[PDB]
Ligand binder design. Sequence first.
Ligand SMILES: O=P(O)(O)O[C@@H]1[C@@H](OP(=O)(O)O)[C@H](OP(=O)(O)O)[C@H](O)[C@H](OP(=O)(O)O)[C@H]1OP(=O)(O)O
Ligand SMILES: Nc1ncnc2c1ncn2[C@@H]1O[C@H](COP(=O)(O)OP(=O)(O)O)[C@@H](O)[C@H]1O
Ligand SMILES: [Mg+2]
Ligand SMILES: [Mg+2]
Ligand SMILES: [Zn+2]
Length: 425
Amino acid sequence: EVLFQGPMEMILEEKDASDWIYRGEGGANLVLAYAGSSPLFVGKVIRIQKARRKAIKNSNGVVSVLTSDEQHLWRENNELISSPNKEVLEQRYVQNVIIPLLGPKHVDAGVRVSVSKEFLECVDKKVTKQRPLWRVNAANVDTSHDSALILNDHSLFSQSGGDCISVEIKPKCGFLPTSRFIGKENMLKTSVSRFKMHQLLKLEYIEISEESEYDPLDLFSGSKERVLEAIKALYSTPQNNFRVFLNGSLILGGSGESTGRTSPEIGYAFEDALKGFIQSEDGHRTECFLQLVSDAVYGSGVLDRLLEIQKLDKLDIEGAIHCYYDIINQPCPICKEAELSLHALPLDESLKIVKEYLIAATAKDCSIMISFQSRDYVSLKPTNQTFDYKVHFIDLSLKPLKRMESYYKLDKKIISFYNRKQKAE
Ligand SMILES: O=P(O)(O)O[C@@H]1[C@@H](OP(=O)(O)O)[C@H](OP(=O)(O)O)[C@H](O)[C@H](OP(=O)(O)O)[C@H]1OP(=O)(O)O
Ligand SMILES: Nc1ncnc2c1ncn2[C@@H]1O[C@H](COP(=O)(O)OP(=O)(O)O)[C@@H](O)[C@H]1O
Ligand SMILES: [Mg+2]
Ligand SMILES: [Mg+2]
Ligand SMILES: [Zn+2]
């Protein structure tokens, strides 16, 4: 019998920085994979929030997690609107808003760990050279936070077997709006997907090398032909929607950003990297892997549950924005003759519309990670091997209420540019 220390919350300090290595990042978070051997952390990633190089302050000048409007918008959950920091808040947003709608089979609020400012600084220093320049220009780790999130590394299975092939799909929005509030001049928004139209604008700003062949309407069609077609397009033009890891190591896609089209060189390189994982011929392992990914995604039904959250955007930003201006008690700058009748709604109805809009916005920007190891399972019809797979949602971030205004401007920019390109053509 031996005396053990009492329970104490874990704190990653400056020393521990050498144990984490760059895995990736999106617009809001940096993700590091644990390299050490502590059981606490093997098979985990650490997700560290970035700061855009304007704080939120309460009426006392104190720095705050939610504005008054946000704390009212999300008031239905007491713990949520009481969160002392952005890691708590995101953790409770997932547990108490997303998990009820999505279910917990493929969703994990994660676990908080304490971090010292020096840990955050050394981490930021350590990885800078592996981040994309433009990501570095836009944001670094927010060293003023005292927590981070520990998640499972969906790029491994470990707890058996050997090689693990994992895939990330960022599916974006898989339906077309039908709102009464889309004017006639914008009606192409009802026949052409936001993702398609945004492609054109992305090209104008040199944010992508080429238009994607991917169509979310195929991926969310519930038709296995279209799902596979979508997987094939994602393979051809990954951009920032498709990644593939071998034992946690990028073998297709971009590191923290979009990548350009798959060239025969990049395809040959990939075809080889599947050697031994996909028992198959020589120029055929890719064809089988794409089939594997299509069958796993389709068989899991995760896309259908996700699509129903994305459809909580019932009125489109062009209707939702009017409820926003009522929510924040500002005269509506959109109305200048308009369907307006939104503005006659009771407060709680305007609140529910915007709240549901932001939840939908979470569902439009989340990712899906599918993990594979040779033998839930999928069996290939040609090769006849069985593969174990797990599916996991990542990146269910709560969206800031003030971004409604940014949502509406971007939408205005997108349909307006897309209309012009239809005209001049
Ligand atoms: O607005 P969208 O649809 O372009 O989505 C943004 C994403 O662009 P995408 O079109 O997927 O390349 C954008 O993706 P990248 O930064 O380009 O990877 C971000 O996810 C952004 O969210 P945040 O800045 O992390 O809060 C996303 O912003 P939200 O709309 O999710 O706030
Ligand atoms: N739990 C995880 N397991 C494995 N990889 C992950 C995990 N979470 C994130 N990643 C990788 O890190 C990237 C950034 O994570 P994400 O939460 O999407 O950041 P952001 O919110 O900034 O977009 C992801 O696109 C994914 O490739
Ligand atoms: Mg992301
Ligand atoms: Mg995000
Ligand atoms: Zn209005």
